[PDB]
Design an enzyme around this catalytic site. Structure first.
Site, PDB file in Angstrom:
ATOM      1  N   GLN C  93       0.738  -1.150   0.194  1.00  0.00           N
ATOM      2  CA  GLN C  93      -0.020  -0.042  -0.097  1.00  0.00           C
ATOM      3  C   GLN C  93       0.957   1.371  -0.018  1.00  0.00           C
ATOM      4  O   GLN C  93       1.107   1.854   1.005  1.00  0.00           O
ATOM      5  CB  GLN C  93      -1.075   0.102   1.120  1.00  0.00           C
ATOM      6  CG  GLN C  93      -2.404  -0.396   0.721  1.00  0.00           C
ATOM      7  CD  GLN C  93      -3.542   0.667   1.321  1.00  0.00           C
ATOM      8  OE1 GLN C  93      -4.631   0.244   1.849  1.00  0.00           O
ATOM      9  NE2 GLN C  93      -3.009   2.053   1.209  1.00  0.00           N
ATOM     10  N   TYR C 278      -0.252  -4.187  51.935  1.00  0.00           N
ATOM     11  CA  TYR C 278      -0.852  -5.640  51.846  1.00  0.00           C
ATOM     12  C   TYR C 278      -0.128  -6.745  50.944  1.00  0.00           C
ATOM     13  O   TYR C 278       0.289  -7.914  51.273  1.00  0.00           O
ATOM     14  CB  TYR C 278      -2.227  -5.639  51.357  1.00  0.00           C
ATOM     15  CG  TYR C 278      -3.250  -5.052  52.211  1.00  0.00           C
ATOM     16  CD1 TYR C 278      -3.428  -5.695  53.503  1.00  0.00           C
ATOM     17  CD2 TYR C 278      -4.159  -3.899  51.948  1.00  0.00           C
ATOM     18  CE1 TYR C 278      -4.379  -5.255  54.332  1.00  0.00           C
ATOM     19  CE2 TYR C 278      -4.938  -3.610  52.914  1.00  0.00           C
ATOM     20  CZ  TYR C 278      -5.185  -4.070  54.012  1.00  0.00           C
ATOM     21  OH  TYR C 278      -5.996  -3.484  55.210  1.00  0.00           O
ATOM     22  N   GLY C 390     -14.543  -7.929  55.992  1.00  0.00           N
ATOM     23  CA  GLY C 390     -14.668  -8.119  54.467  1.00  0.00           C
ATOM     24  C   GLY C 390     -13.626  -9.054  54.018  1.00  0.00           C
ATOM     25  N   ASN C 426     -11.269  -9.475  47.046  1.00  0.00           N
ATOM     26  CA  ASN C 426     -10.741  -9.072  48.202  1.00  0.00           C
ATOM     27  C   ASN C 426      -9.254  -9.306  48.025  1.00  0.00           C
ATOM     28  O   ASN C 426      -8.832 -10.041  47.433  1.00  0.00           O
ATOM     29  CB  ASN C 426     -11.106  -9.995  49.617  1.00  0.00           C
ATOM     30  CG  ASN C 426     -12.554 -10.054  49.680  1.00  0.00           C
ATOM     31  OD1 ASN C 426     -13.318 -11.216  49.974  1.00  0.00           O
ATOM     32  ND2 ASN C 426     -13.161  -8.953  49.699  1.00  0.00           N
TER      33      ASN C 426
HETATM   34  C1  F43 Z   1      -7.971   4.964  58.533  1.00  0.00           C
HETATM   35  C2  F43 Z   1      -9.199   3.949  58.070  1.00  0.00           C
HETATM   36  C3  F43 Z   1     -10.405   4.920  57.714  1.00  0.00           C
HETATM   37  C4  F43 Z   1     -11.100   3.873  56.827  1.00  0.00           C
HETATM   38  O1  F43 Z   1     -12.255   4.347  56.185  1.00  0.00           O
HETATM   39  N1  F43 Z   1     -10.319   3.130  56.263  1.00  0.00           N
HETATM   40  C5  F43 Z   1      -9.060   3.191  56.727  1.00  0.00           C
HETATM   41  C6  F43 Z   1      -8.027   4.156  55.708  1.00  0.00           C
HETATM   42  C7  F43 Z   1      -8.201   3.471  54.472  1.00  0.00           C
HETATM   43  C8  F43 Z   1      -7.512   3.976  53.191  1.00  0.00           C
HETATM   44  C9  F43 Z   1      -6.138   4.758  53.783  1.00  0.00           C
HETATM   45  C10 F43 Z   1      -5.837   6.268  53.053  1.00  0.00           C
HETATM   46  C11 F43 Z   1      -6.511   7.437  53.739  1.00  0.00           C
HETATM   47  O2  F43 Z   1      -6.394   8.600  53.336  1.00  0.00           O
HETATM   48  O3  F43 Z   1      -7.608   7.107  54.571  1.00  0.00           O
HETATM   49  C12 F43 Z   1      -7.206   3.045  52.287  1.00  0.00           C
HETATM   50  C13 F43 Z   1      -6.188   3.289  51.465  1.00  0.00           C
HETATM   51  C14 F43 Z   1      -8.666   2.562  51.623  1.00  0.00           C
HETATM   52  C15 F43 Z   1      -8.106   2.008  50.187  1.00  0.00           C
HETATM   53  N2  F43 Z   1      -8.657   2.486  49.253  1.00  0.00           N
HETATM   54  O4  F43 Z   1      -8.002   0.610  50.206  1.00  0.00           O
HETATM   55  C16 F43 Z   1      -6.872   1.773  53.208  1.00  0.00           C
HETATM   56  N3  F43 Z   1      -7.549   2.264  54.529  1.00  0.00           N
HETATM   57 NI1  F43 Z   1      -7.001   0.932  55.961  1.00  0.00          NI
HETATM   58  N4  F43 Z   1      -5.259   0.093  55.284  1.00  0.00           N
HETATM   59  C17 F43 Z   1      -4.257  -0.650  55.552  1.00  0.00           C
HETATM   60  C18 F43 Z   1      -4.466  -1.627  56.864  1.00  0.00           C
HETATM   61  C19 F43 Z   1      -5.387  -1.248  57.954  1.00  0.00           C
HETATM   62  C20 F43 Z   1      -5.507  -1.781  59.344  1.00  0.00           C
HETATM   63  C21 F43 Z   1      -4.533  -1.290  60.241  1.00  0.00           C
HETATM   64  C22 F43 Z   1      -4.312  -2.252  61.546  1.00  0.00           C
HETATM   65  C23 F43 Z   1      -3.754  -1.262  62.622  1.00  0.00           C
HETATM   66  O5  F43 Z   1      -4.468  -1.526  63.736  1.00  0.00           O
HETATM   67  O6  F43 Z   1      -2.995  -0.338  62.574  1.00  0.00           O
HETATM   68  C24 F43 Z   1      -6.945  -1.513  59.732  1.00  0.00           C
HETATM   69  C25 F43 Z   1      -7.805  -2.588  59.007  1.00  0.00           C
HETATM   70  C26 F43 Z   1      -8.330  -3.517  60.299  1.00  0.00           C
HETATM   71  O7  F43 Z   1      -8.707  -3.061  61.650  1.00  0.00           O
HETATM   72  O8  F43 Z   1      -8.087  -4.658  60.161  1.00  0.00           O
HETATM   73  C27 F43 Z   1      -7.253  -0.268  58.801  1.00  0.00           C
HETATM   74  C28 F43 Z   1      -8.235   0.666  58.990  1.00  0.00           C
HETATM   75  C29 F43 Z   1      -8.616   1.723  58.337  1.00  0.00           C
HETATM   76  N5  F43 Z   1      -8.337   2.081  57.184  1.00  0.00           N
HETATM   77  C30 F43 Z   1      -9.498   2.541  59.254  1.00  0.00           C
HETATM   78  C31 F43 Z   1      -9.445   2.609  60.625  1.00  0.00           C
HETATM   79  C32 F43 Z   1      -9.985   3.921  61.342  1.00  0.00           C
HETATM   80  C33 F43 Z   1     -11.461   3.948  61.113  1.00  0.00           C
HETATM   81  O9  F43 Z   1     -11.979   3.161  62.091  1.00  0.00           O
HETATM   82  O10 F43 Z   1     -12.119   4.634  60.480  1.00  0.00           O
HETATM   83  N6  F43 Z   1      -6.372  -0.231  57.644  1.00  0.00           N
HETATM   84  C34 F43 Z   1      -3.193  -2.573  57.077  1.00  0.00           C
HETATM   85  O11 F43 Z   1      -3.537  -3.392  57.946  1.00  0.00           O
HETATM   86  C35 F43 Z   1      -2.250  -2.510  56.172  1.00  0.00           C
HETATM   87  C36 F43 Z   1      -2.558  -2.214  54.901  1.00  0.00           C
HETATM   88  C37 F43 Z   1      -3.303  -0.870  54.548  1.00  0.00           C
HETATM   89  C38 F43 Z   1      -3.749  -0.302  53.490  1.00  0.00           C
HETATM   90  C39 F43 Z   1      -3.003   0.506  52.736  1.00  0.00           C
HETATM   91  C40 F43 Z   1      -1.516  -0.440  51.921  1.00  0.00           C
HETATM   92  O12 F43 Z   1      -1.896  -1.659  51.715  1.00  0.00           O
HETATM   93  O13 F43 Z   1      -0.453   0.249  51.873  1.00  0.00           O
HETATM   94  C41 F43 Z   1      -4.743   0.614  53.801  1.00  0.00           C
HETATM   95  C42 F43 Z   1      -6.091   0.594  52.937  1.00  0.00           C
HETATM   96  C1  LIG Z   2     -15.130  -3.410  43.574  1.00  0.00           C
HETATM   97  C2  LIG Z   2     -15.439  -3.666  44.784  1.00  0.00           C
HETATM   98  O1  LIG Z   2     -16.685  -4.276  44.980  1.00  0.00           O
HETATM   99  P1  LIG Z   2     -17.945  -4.321  46.078  1.00  0.00           P
HETATM  100  O2  LIG Z   2     -17.195  -3.075  46.719  1.00  0.00           O
HETATM  101  O3  LIG Z   2     -19.058  -3.694  45.466  1.00  0.00           O
HETATM  102  O4  LIG Z   2     -17.884  -5.524  46.921  1.00  0.00           O
HETATM  103  C3  LIG Z   2     -14.444  -4.486  45.797  1.00  0.00           C
HETATM  104  N1  LIG Z   2     -14.149  -3.910  46.938  1.00  0.00           N
HETATM  105  C4  LIG Z   2     -14.551  -4.585  48.020  1.00  0.00           C
HETATM  106  O5  LIG Z   2     -15.055  -5.638  48.370  1.00  0.00           O
HETATM  107  C5  LIG Z   2     -14.380  -3.778  49.213  1.00  0.00           C
HETATM  108  C6  LIG Z   2     -13.639  -2.769  49.380  1.00  0.00           C
HETATM  109  C7  LIG Z   2     -13.013  -2.221  50.542  1.00  0.00           C
HETATM  110  C8  LIG Z   2     -11.338  -2.472  50.615  1.00  0.00           C
HETATM  111  C9  LIG Z   2     -10.705  -3.367  51.473  1.00  0.00           C
HETATM  112  C10 LIG Z   2     -10.349  -2.858  52.738  1.00  0.00           C
HETATM  113  S1  LIG Z   2      -8.905  -2.617  53.256  1.00  0.00           S
HETATM  114  S2  LIG Z   2      -8.918  -1.007  54.596  1.00  0.00           S
HETATM  115  C11 LIG Z   2     -10.665  -1.183  55.188  1.00  0.00           C
HETATM  116  C12 LIG Z   2     -10.928  -1.929  56.378  1.00  0.00           C
HETATM  117  S3  LIG Z   2     -12.464  -1.926  57.068  1.00  0.00           S
HETATM  118  O6  LIG Z   2     -12.710  -0.899  58.239  1.00  0.00           O
HETATM  119  O7  LIG Z   2     -13.345  -1.606  55.898  1.00  0.00           O
HETATM  120  O8  LIG Z   2     -12.995  -3.180  57.481  1.00  0.00           O
HETATM  121  C13 LIG Z   2     -13.188  -4.438  44.900  1.00  0.00           C
HETATM  122  O9  LIG Z   2     -12.888  -5.632  44.359  1.00  0.00           O
HETATM  123  O10 LIG Z   2     -12.065  -3.768  45.343  1.00  0.00           O
END
Ligand code: F43
Ligand SMILES: C[C@@H](OP(=O)(O)O)[C@H](NC(=O)/C=C/CCCCSSCCS(=O)(=O)O)C(=O)O
Lengths: 296, 56, 495, 194, 111, 114, 47, 92
Positions: C93, C278, C390, C426
């Site tokens: 072409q 994680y 969860g 999860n």
């Molecule tokens: C700070 C929060 C608020 C909320 O809605 N989720 C949080 C925060 C959220 C945000 C953090 C960013 C921010 O600006 O908030 C994200 C990234 C959500 C997501 N998109 O996956 C996250 N957590 Ni959480 N979150 C984590 C973790 C954890 C562990 C922390 C254990 C402790 O006692 O210190 C626990 C869950 C549990 O109780 O089992 C936890 C809780 C919580 N997590 C609760 C705790 C306070 C609440 O009652 O509101 N994270 C972890 O266990 C490690 C991995 C880590 C994830 C990010 C990463 O993988 O780098 C992050 C994952």
């Molecule tokens: C797409 C979405 O589906 P669903 O929310 O409709 O189940 C699905 N998310 C989930 O099942 C749940 C999301 C929460 C993120 C995992 C939590 S790690 S930190 C939060 C700790 S807690 O205080 O929420 O127990 C996914 O594949 O990411």
């Protein structure tokens, strides 16, 4: 008698461990609590070393043997600019700190250049006040060779530079030049370990020199006595309020204001002025204490 | 003899009884001390080694 | 004395650098984020842009329909042509435009064959040599599996998959293959045989890294949600460079974590911060390595590498022993507990070690997941906590679904993937599942897990990402010394 | 051109491949002119934006101390509805170590509402002029809206004894500061110091 | 009082050949410092020469012949002057005045 | 970018190549520069760094920042020539004419680089 | 600039009415309705 | 070979419009939280920091390099004139 080590553990029940150390007669030279872990540089008698290891393993602590935790090192950099200070110089200082030593960055006023580099008398004396000086030089053989007049101090010396091998009449460690990254490669770590081994060998030699004619009182117990007697040492804002040298101490308090109080401190049955040389330091007008030997 | 080290032997019969007295002089060979503060307040020590003075 | 303005120091451990398992490199936690690490991005790019096409039906069409004779010289000429056409050069072409070669320097068309006689007189520039890249026994196994068949590996440029999605790759390869075929053998540009070539290269002989997910999932092919666990096990090339089964399983665990848990779950199905801590829990410190080595030592001390056939009793024994050991280690060393502060991290690590141990004892992947689920529900009773709520959805239905035979619940763990109904949501499960699937075969010393073609294709030395040592490459990317493709600086102004 | 001696900290850094500074530590530069305050020893603050300012000042001929705050991350407890995530604070020893310097340079982040209240709590105990080095464009008046003494926009009821003397915008955390920003900081320090 | 610091190989010589160096006279006190002996030193003599320090105990072989190995007690900081693989064995600090005043007629008799 | 160092010192060559690479990365200048060649003359103290950019004043300022970062501290007397190829000579002594001639030779060599 | 006027801060554009002028440290200051001092050089009249 | 066409597709691909009136109504009535233009401005500040890679008041959380997402913005618009002029013009 008193071998100095570092204990790394938690703050929970650390007060009981400090009580045990006080009971067996040790001294806590250094203490730092980060968030929940505490690092303690402790000097305890040799006959209680195994006892302290057993006690530390009860609190799930860790004992790290620090071969340099009784000396202060003068890391001499040609300048405090971006070329040497924020990298290499800090790596040298922090690696020295990792083995218990107390470093002091000495940035020469006119240390940079090839034929325009010079070292002042005040900087010379300030370097001499330390136990050992580490020079952090460049990475060109000609520049280093035309710079030997910098390393003119009657102190143990270790020179670091870029080229792997130098022909200077001093101890030299290669592959540590002027860089711009954090020292994290295997070769760089090995060169840092080589520098540590050289300074350790020099310090152990000097320790034998001192052990030929031991001082009347150890520096660590002298520091403890000064802390117990002088009540102004807890108001010092410097990083190390009292520095433990090889054969003396550095008191970070004003000399004009506190030399008479320091001299008139009774240890044992002696007055401090009769067993140590108390003099003003070139270091921010601090007090420098040099212990006398049992011969006099 | 409740506790033994290479420097002292301590007695723990009265370990929770308070005292408020300071006698901080040298803990020489065979010196008898009572700890006056902390977790082990009231313990009686006998020192087998010449050690430095302690405020506790 | 209570001063409310003193504050509370926090996050001391997170300030310290993260070592990388089996390496000697220390990196910050911020550099292990998939957006901040060019090595993880290049890993996903290299997996995404790979399509394997079986060039045997096309040869048969050329021989029996078009009356054209196919010889190794003609195949060499075809390879020369397609290496020019696949990046975007013009073959027919008149008057076309072409893509800049600087943007497609990572684009290769490679050929491998299980026929040694044909592989002998083939241009070594375009040849993926199975004999040279694999040890003798592994090379023989791979050749026996592949057979006397010729395959072409097309690696379309990374820029293509970055501008577009992952469904572009197969179509790109198919168009360029058809063009190179019609221009290398001097055929008519468009006839019935051209349609035969197009159909063969589009679906009959094509091998996709990941299947499409139509419907609710709504995604195209060659997306991380379509990559099965066995396929990812075959992508990792530690099996041909190391003989340590635990090391192979752990490299597969690291790759699976970095792909699924980081990219797929924290970006494709979530957003923002993602799940970095994680996933890094499984490949940063030797915690998982130490637990897995303990599992292997225990299994070899009482069972052997394949000394027992998969039964329930061995699953209970191995999984319980490894879980108890891992939780005891967490109790004994506060450094380990503060490293894996979240319960999910700990649960995943202990369960991964237990599943790897069961796989090393029995050589069955479904027994491995059964051990993983027993470890989860034993962790729950040991510490009275599992993870974020969860987390244990799939872990509760797991035991029932691991050996199930019902349509929606049954699948060999090699054939499972992120689109398995329980595993679809999860974090903290999928990379370890891939590692367990790999460990099922590392116990037997197998050359491959699910697809020999994928193993041979990713043994290619010209890939940008080195899949022999994934953790080393991740560390290199974290230290800003990994060169990645897909960048467009020749078409951009100076900044 | 004069000799510059730094009192290195007495404690080591963050592990092997980690940072060189430690939280809650102070490194006196003998002659106390400028103290650079870092919120944490982490990569977001140390050696990327902070040691660069340090070597810029040390190149200008002005001795510099670097203080790493024990709790520099978060917002103060006095912020509206309290703090979240973490609590910001200043220790009395940290305040005393700062207050023996002629001037202070402090590095702040992105969110405006965090920076204003952090600066208010910081200047509640610091009585020397300070320079705020942040990323976001923040106006030298929003600090006065919550009570902070400010060179251009004074408050009616001052809640701080420290004066925000200059605000420099465009310095990103964890990224190398260009020479232009260093020159601006040096000029501000020189004109507001002697 | 001498004290061995640098291991090298000459300290292994000294360990038992110091009693062989017993009852030996001063050989010279020239710019090459004060040397004693002179007894056999079979340590391989390398022409490569390493820097030494003030009042440092040295076992250099003066003349590259095994039999004439001198107990050279260095006084001044000597740069490249000598031979041997690494004559550095120890450091003299205690009794420095004794080593300085030591003359050719004087011997070390008992070590 | 392309990095090459002309030095007779083995360690200096590798170390300063790493320094040049790091200074390019820190300023984010790698993709905006075609070539970066440094000539090291330490016996007579002077260094030459040439820059060939890809294809405003802010870019030039970043380039002089790069020169300031890479050059050794002691070489404080510097002069630059800019005719789409920026070349600077740094020495502790006043710049001689032969050094400027070497600088223009490097500039012309960099111009025809392709 | 006088009490009751309308001024806006050039840096942000906050609108308010001048409340009082309270010189201090030989320096003019302008108080707006938000009880915040300003500088006359950083303020200008609007209508 | 054309970055303009690539950015044309990028800008369309990375755009999502979300209405915030049900959220405000749920906050006011069910959650018992007042919603004012000042609170809307605060939310806009929060989302502008957090959308690219940010983590609010959590230094221990991994965040994306800010220079890597310089094109990320969160903007607001409304058909309500008074609310529109009460909002910050930085992100309207
Ligand atoms: C700070 C929060 C608020 C909320 O809605 N989720 C949080 C925060 C959220 C945000 C953090 C960013 C921010 O600006 O908030 C994200 C990234 C959500 C997501 N998109 O996956 C996250 N957590 Ni959480 N979150 C984590 C973790 C954890 C562990 C922390 C254990 C402790 O006692 O210190 C626990 C869950 C549990 O109780 O089992 C936890 C809780 C919580 N997590 C609760 C705790 C306070 C609440 O009652 O509101 N994270 C972890 O266990 C490690 C991995 C880590 C994830 C990010 C990463 O993988 O780098 C992050 C994952
Ligand atoms: C797409 C979405 O589906 P669903 O929310 O409709 O189940 C699905 N998310 C989930 O099942 C749940 C999301 C929460 C993120 C995992 C939590 S790690 S930190 C939060 C700790 S807690 O205080 O929420 O127990 C996914 O594949 O990411």
């Amino acid at each position: 008698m008193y071998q100095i080590i570092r204990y790394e553990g938690g703050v929970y029940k650390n007060n009981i461990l400090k009580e045990w150390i006080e009971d067996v007669g040790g001294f806590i030279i250094q203490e730092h609590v980060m968030q929940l872990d505490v690092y303690m540089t402790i000097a305890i008698p040799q006959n209680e070393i195994e006892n302290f290891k057993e006690e530390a393993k009860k609190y799930k602590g860790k004992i790290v043997e620090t071969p340099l935790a009784g000396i202060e090192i003068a890391i001499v950099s040609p300048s405090l600019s971006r070329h040497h200070l924020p990298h290499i110089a800090c790596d040298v200082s922090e690696y020295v700190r990792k083995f218990g030593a107390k470093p002091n960055m000495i940035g020469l006023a006119h240390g940079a250049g090839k034929n325009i580099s010079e070292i002042r008398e005040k900087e010379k004396r300030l370097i001499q006040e330390h136990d050992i000086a580490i020079y952090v030089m460049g990475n060109f053989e000609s520049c280093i060779l035309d710079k030997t007049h910098l390393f003119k101090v009657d102190i143990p010396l270790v020179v670091t530079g870029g080229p792997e091998t130098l022909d200077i009449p001093y101890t030299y460690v290669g592959n540590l030049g002027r860089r711009a990254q954090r020292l994290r490669k295997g070769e760089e770590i090995r060169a840092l370990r080589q520098m540590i081994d050289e300074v350790t060998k020099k310090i152990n030699d000097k320790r034998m020199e001192l052990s030929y004619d031991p001082p009347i009182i150890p520096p660590v117990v002298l520091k403890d006595e000064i802390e117990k007697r002088i009540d102004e040492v807890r108001g010092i804002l410097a990083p190390m309020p009292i520095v433990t040298q090889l054969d003396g101490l550095r008191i970070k308090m004003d000399y004009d204001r506190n030399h008479e109080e320091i001299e008139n401190v009774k240890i044992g049955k002696y007055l401090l002025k009769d067993i140590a040389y108390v003099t003003r330091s070139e270091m921010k007008n601090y007090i420098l204490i040099k212990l006398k030997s049992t011969s006099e | 003899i409740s506790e033994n080290t290479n420097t002292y032997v301590a007695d723990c019969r009265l370990q929770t009884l308070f005292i408020d007295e300071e006698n901080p002089e040298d803990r020489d060979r065979g010196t008898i001390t009572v700890r006056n503060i902390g977790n082990g307040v009231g313990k009686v020590y006998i020192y087998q080694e010449s050690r430095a003075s302690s405020l506790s | 004395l209570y001063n409310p303005d003193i504050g509370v120091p926090l996050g001391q451990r997170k300030l310290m650098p993260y070592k990388l398992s089996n390496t000697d490199d220390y990196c910050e936690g911020d550099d292990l984020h998939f957006l901040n690490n060019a090595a993880i991005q290049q890993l996903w790019d290299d997996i995404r842009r790979t399509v394997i096409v079986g060039m045997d039906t096309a040869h048969s069409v050329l021989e029996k329909r078009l009356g054209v004779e196919v010889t190794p010289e003609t195949i060499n000429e075809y390879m020369h042509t397609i290496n020019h056409s696949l990046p975007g050069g013009a073959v027919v072409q008149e008057h076309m435009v072409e893509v800049h070669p600087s943007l497609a320097w990572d684009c290769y068309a490679r050929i491998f064959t299980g026929d040694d006689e044909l592989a002998d007189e083939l241009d070594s520039r375009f040849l993926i040599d199975i004999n040279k890249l694999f040890p003798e026994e592994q090379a023989e196994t791979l050749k026996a599996a592949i057979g006397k068949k010729t395959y072409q590996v097309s690696r379309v440029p990374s820029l293509v998959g970055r501008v577009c999605d992952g469904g572009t790759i197969s179509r790109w390869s198919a168009m360029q293959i058809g063009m190179s075929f019609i221009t290398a053998y001097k055929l008519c540009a468009g006839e019935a045989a051209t349609a035969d070539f197009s159909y063969a290269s589009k679906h009959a002989d094509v091998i996709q890294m990941g299947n499409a997910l139509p419907g609710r999932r709504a995604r195209g092919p060659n997306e991380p949600g379509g990559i099965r666990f066995g396929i990812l096990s075959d992508v990792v090339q530690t099996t041909r460079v190391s003989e340590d089964p635990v090391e192979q399983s752990l490299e597969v665990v690291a790759t699976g974590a970095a792909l699924y848990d980081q990219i797929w779950l924290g970006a494709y199905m979530s957003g923002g911060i993602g799940f970095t801590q994680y996933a890094t829990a499984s490949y940063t410190d030797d915690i998982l390595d130490d637990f897995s080595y303990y599992a292997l030592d225990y299994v070899e001390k009482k069972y052997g590498r394949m000394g027992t056939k998969a039964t329930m009793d061995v699953v209970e024994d191995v999984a319980g022993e490894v879980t108890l050991y891992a939780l005891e280690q967490y109790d004994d060393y506060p450094a380990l507990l503060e490293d894996h502060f979240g319960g999910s991290q700990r649960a995943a690590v202990a369960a991964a070690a237990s599943g790897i141990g069961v796989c090393m004892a029995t050589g069955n992947s479904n027994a491995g997941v059964n051990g993983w689920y027993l470890s989860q529900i034993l962790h729950k009773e040991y510490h009275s906590r599992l993870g974020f709520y969860g987390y244990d959805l799939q872990d509760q239905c797991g035991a029932s679904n691991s050996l199930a035979i019902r349509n929606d619940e049954a699948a060999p763990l090699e054939l499972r993937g992120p689109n398995y109904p329980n595993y679809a949501m999860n974090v903290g499960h999928q990379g370890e599942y891939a590692g367990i699937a790999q460990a099922a075969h590392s116990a037997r010393g197998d050359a491959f897990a699910l697809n020999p073609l994928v193993k041979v294709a990713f043994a290619d030395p010209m890939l940008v990402f080195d899949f022999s040592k994934p953790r080393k490459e991740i560390a290199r990317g974290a230290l800003r010394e990994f060169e990645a493709a897909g960048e467009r600086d020749v078409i951009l102004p100076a900044k | 051109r004069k000799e510059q001696i730094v009192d290195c900290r007495a404690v080591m850094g963050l592990g092997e491949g980690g940072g060189l500074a430690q939280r809650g530590t102070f490194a006196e530069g003998l002659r106390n002119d400028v103290v650079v305050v870092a919120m944490s020893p982490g990569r977001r603050h140390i050696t990327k934006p902070v040691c660069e300012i340090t070597y810029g000042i040390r190149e200008a001929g002005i001795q510099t101390s670097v203080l790493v705050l024990d709790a520099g991350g978060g917002i103060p407890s006095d912020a509206p509805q309290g703090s979240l995530g973490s609590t910001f604070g200043l220790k009395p020893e940290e305040a005393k170590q700062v207050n023996r310097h002629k001037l202070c340079v402090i590095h702040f982040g992105n969110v405006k509402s965090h920076i204003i209240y952090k600066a208010r709590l910081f200047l509640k105990y610091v009585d020397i002029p300070t320079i705020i080095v942040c990323q976001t464009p923040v106006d030298m008046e929003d600090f006065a809206a919550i009570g902070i003494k400010t060179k251009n926009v004074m408050p009616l009821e001052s809640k701080t004894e420290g004066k925000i003397v200059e605000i420099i915008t465009g310095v990103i955390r964890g990224e190398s500061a260009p020479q232009k920003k260093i020159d601006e900081i040096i000029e501000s320090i020189k004109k507001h110091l002697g | 009082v001498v004290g061995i610091t640098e291991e090298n190989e000459t300290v292994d010589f000294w360990n038992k050949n110091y009693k062989s160096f017993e009852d030996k006279s001063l050989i010279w006190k020239s710019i090459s410092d004060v040397s004693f002996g002179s007894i056999e030193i079979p340590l391989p003599v390398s022409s490569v020469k390493q820097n030494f320090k003030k009042w440092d105990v040295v076992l250099s072989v003066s003349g590259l012949d095994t039999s004439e190995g001198n107990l050279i007690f260095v006084q001044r900081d000597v740069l490249e002057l000598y031979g041997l693989e690494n004559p550095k064995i120890g450091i003299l600090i205690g009794g420095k005045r004794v080593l300085k005043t030591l003359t050719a007629d004087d011997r070390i008799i008992s070590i | 970018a392309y990095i090459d160092v002309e030095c007779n010192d083995e360690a200096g060559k590798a170390i300063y190549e790493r320094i040049i690479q790091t200074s390019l990365e820190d300023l984010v200048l790698g993709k905006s520069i075609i070539k970066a060649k440094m000539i090291c003359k330490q016996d007579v103290p002077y260094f030459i760094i040439g820059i060939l950019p890809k294809s405003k004043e802010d870019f030039i300022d970043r380039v002089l920042d790069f020169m300031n970062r890479v050059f050794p501290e002691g070489m404080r007397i510097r002069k630059t020539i800019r005719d789409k190829t920026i070349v600077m000579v740094a020495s502790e002594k006043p710049i001689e004419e032969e050094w400027m001639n070497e600088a223009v030779k490097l500039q012309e060599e960099l111009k025809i680089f392709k | 600039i006088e009490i009751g006027s309308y001024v806006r801060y050039i840096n942000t554009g906050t609108h308010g009415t001048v409340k009082a002028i309270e010189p201090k440290n030989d320096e003019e200051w302008v108080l707006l309705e938000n009880d915040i001092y300003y500088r006359p050089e950083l303020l200008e009249l609007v209508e």
